[PDB]
A paper describes a structure:
While OprCWT and most single alanine mutants can be (partly) loaded via Cu(II) incubation, this is not the case for the C143A mutant. To provide support for this, we determined the crystal structures of the OprC C143A mutant cocrystallised with Cu(II) or silver Ag(I). For each crystal, datasets were collected at 8,800 eV and 9,175 eV to distinguish between both metals. For C143A cocrystallised with Cu(II), no anomalous peaks are visible at both energies, showing that Cu(II) binding is indeed abolished. Crucially, in the presence of silver, the same 3 anomalous peaks are visible as for WT OprC (compare Fig 3A and 3D), strongly suggesting that the C143A mutant can still bind Cu(I). All 4 residues in the OprC binding site contribute to copper binding, but not to the same extent and, in some cases, not equally for both copper redox states. This is illustrated by Cys143, which is essential for high-affinity Cu(II) binding but dispensable for Cu(I).
Here, we show that Pseudomonas aeruginosa OprC is an outer membrane, TonB-dependent transporter that is conserved in many Proteobacteria and which mediates acquisition of both reduced and oxidised ionic copper via an unprecedented CxxxM-HxM metal binding site. As indicated by the successful structure solution, OprC contains a single bound copper and shows the typical fold of a TBDT, with a large 22-stranded β-barrel occluded by an N-terminal approximately 15 kDa plug domain that, like in other TBDTs, completely occludes the lumen of the barrel. The copper binding site comprises residues Cys143 and Met147 in the plug domain and His323 and Met325 in the barrel wall.
Author numbering: 66 to 444, 451 to 556, 560 to 723
Amino acid sequence: LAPSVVTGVAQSSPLTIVTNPKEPRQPVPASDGADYLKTIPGFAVIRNGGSNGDPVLRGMFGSRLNILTNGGMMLGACPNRMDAPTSYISPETYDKLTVIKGPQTVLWGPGASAGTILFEREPERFGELGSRVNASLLAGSNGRFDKVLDAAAGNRLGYLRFTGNHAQSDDYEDGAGNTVPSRWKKWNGDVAVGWTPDEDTLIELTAGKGDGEARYAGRGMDGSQFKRESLGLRFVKSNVSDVLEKVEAQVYYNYADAIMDNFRLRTPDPSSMMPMPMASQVDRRTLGGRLAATWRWDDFKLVTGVDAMRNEHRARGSKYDMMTDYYTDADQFPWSKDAVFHNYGAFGELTWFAAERDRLIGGLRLDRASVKDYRQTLKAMANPTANDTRADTLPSGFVRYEHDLADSPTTLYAGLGHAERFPDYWELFSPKRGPNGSVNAFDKIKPEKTTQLDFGLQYNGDKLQAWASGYVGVVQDFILFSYREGSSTQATNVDARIMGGELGASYQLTGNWKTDASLAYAWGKNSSDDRALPQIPPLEARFGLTYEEGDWSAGSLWRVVAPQNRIARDQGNVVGKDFDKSAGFGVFSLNGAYRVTRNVKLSAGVDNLFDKDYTEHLNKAGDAGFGFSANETVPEPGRTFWTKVDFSF
Ligand SMILES: [Ag+]
Ligand SMILES: [Ag+]
Ligand SMILES: [Ag+]
């Protein structure tokens, strides 16, 4: 009882955060997966415009994070990651978002250096014949309007479930009265049919579509289409044997189909190097499965399984004859395939419940990765590695020990983990140069190998609930983009050390008054060049205060961010580079929520009450074609008002 808005999420069990994405969140998320991570300490976000941020976890970017949707993986097709994996995820339409920090699981795919992230839906539990609806409407500054409907009907034997949404916002303004190019629009409709013959069985087919557009204050091109499309089939059988607790089988298909241009939103910058109307279409076809058995007997729990994943990428672009001024749009030429990846793996995880206060946990997986370059030419010139292939075999695993204190309600844990990761599409194809003496990046960029120590504690008290997690680790053959002036990238392997932590606490002062706080630090050194790693988000703290009283509640929130002076100029990732140290800043916010009926909640909020003008260290450099000076990064929104209503029947 007693509703409120989510300003931070605490680490509830060791290494693991779990939150329900359907709750409101204090700086309102732009209906995008990265934004539902801001409220989890350790996550920072590279802003591209109004939405579609690239999420960074403990300084770690890109495929270093496994983002899953119903156990399945979905990748975008932009060579500059305009349509990052989270670009396609509306959390509101899911039922559970869960994060495991570190390389401390092997059940959910390969090369999870930084952490894995699992957006899930749960299958309906229908006894009688019956229905449930639940839905939300939101309304904010700058045209921000969102609709979300999730409904289902069924009985003991089966169910049908529709979930969908539509969301949009106009260009927002920063704290200096500047309209930031940041229009965006999204929608999504997925259905799920489920068959449950007995309670020990469940089969479930699911399909869905989504589209979206989004203007990008970074970039220099905009996203006029981000088509997504998904199939899925999952099998779950409980209590086969007395030791065979459950079997899981799961297949997934995920197609992405993006269109970027410089004329469907914005006008071609006449002084740029794209003064001509231009577009480029791109798509990514991902197919994959997973099969896993959970054995429980005596004091142990073994979870063996295998998984596989294939994915394919193609592109095609417009042409402009500038003496007819004729424009042949990119849908007239044929798709050129340029890359196919494969991966198969096997994994197990064993947990020993020694005594009732000690847990030992171990896991390994073996992954066989491979990739073939299909580019017959380059940007035209010859591609010296056309139709070439490569592969590798990448063992990864971990151990974690967790002890429960005798008296206080405290858990301690320490864990050691190794994770190897094959280069992703962007590390291999998107850079214009490889390492020195290499022909291109594809030929020589080495798989990245991470070894890291995690530890921390949980205090699950009465009035005081605290947690902390730290990490120290090294990174062999870290993959690192280096920028030279058009402007050109080079990908290299370097060695790195990393160190950091997160901690937080929430104290229930009196029966009405609650306060909480959080701290997030990351740190990275490039050992190869003796210098700092780029794109590391500075130290930040969050303070919350909350009054609750029966049916209603009111909140305040302080975000305070230190400056980042550890930077590597003209180095970074496929998306962005460092150039200047960042300023610190404070942002303050208010919120309230009210339970009208058993079925209708209300909430509202002011974000950035004092209309602070600020930008974040990780945000992209703004485009010269809009009013952006050299290297000036895209600013965060100024003051924004939002109200939101939540139904459930
Ligand atoms: Ag693009
Ligand atoms: Ag051009
Ligand atoms: Ag362009």
